[PDB]
Amino acid sequence: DCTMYICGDSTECSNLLLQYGSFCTQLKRALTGIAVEQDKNTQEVFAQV
Amino acid sequence: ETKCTLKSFTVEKGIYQTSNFRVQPTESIVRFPNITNLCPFDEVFNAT
């Protein structure tokens, strides 16, 4: 979670972070993609029968 | 909210992460030692 990690509970920190753009969209997208990739690997490996 | 996150008016079948849930604090507490080391302010001001 970008907010919790970078800023935490600081609302002014969150306001400053919102100026940086869409870095966190890419971060979360890559993390979810890695998760789905690991799941697909497990499936392709163990669900061949 | 899923629409607003995906930036699209249509959503396909699946599971989508949209926001974060966190319990907000209820009240604030402040703690300090037993601060009782007072100076002779009164003893000096009320002196004869």
UniProtKB/Swiss-Prot annotation, chain A:
Q: Which domain of life is it from?
A: Viruses
Q: What is this protein called?
A: Spike protein S2
Shown segment, full-protein numbering: 737 to 785 of 1273
Say what the protein does: Precursor of the fusion protein processed in the biosynthesis of the S protein and the formation of virus particle. Mediates fusion of the virion and cellular membranes by functioning as a class I viral fusion protein. Contains two viral fusion peptides that are unmasked after cleavage. The S2/S2' cleavage occurs during virus entry at the cell membrane by host TMPRSS2 or during endocytosis by host CSTL.
State the encoding gene: S
Q: Which cysteines are joined by disulfide bonds?
A: C2-C24, C7-C13
Curated annotation (Swiss-Prot), chain B:
Origin: domain of life: Viruses
What residue spans carry the region label Disordered? 22-38
List the glycosylation sites. Answer: T26, S28, N34, N46
Subunit and partners: Binds to host ACE2. RBD also interacts with the N-linked glycan on 'Asn-90' of ACE2. Cleavage of S generates a polybasic C-terminal sequence on S1 that binds to host Neuropilin-1 (NRP1) and Neuropilin-2 (NRP2) receptors. Interacts with host integrin alpha-5/beta-1 (ITGA5:ITGB1) and with ACE2 in complex with integrin alpha-5/beta-1 (ITGA5:ITGB1). May interact via cytoplasmic c-terminus with M protein. May interact (via N-terminus) with host bilirubin and biliverdin, thereby preventing antibody binding to the SARS-CoV-2 spike NTD via an allosteric mechanism.
* Known role: Attaches the virion to the cell membrane by interacting with host receptor, initiating the infection. The major receptor is host ACE2. When S2/S2' has been cleaved, binding to the receptor triggers direct fusion at the cell membrane. When S2/S2' has not been cleaved, binding to the receptor results in internalization of the virus by endocytosis using host TFRC and GRM2 and leading to fusion of the virion membrane with the host endosomal membrane. Alternatively, may use NRP1/NRP2 and integrin as entry receptors.
Protein name as catalogued: Spike protein S1
Q: Which organism is it from?
A: Severe acute respiratory syndrome coronavirus 2 (2019-nCoV)
Gene that encodes the chain: S
**Which region of the full protein is contained in this chain?**
298 to 345 of 1273
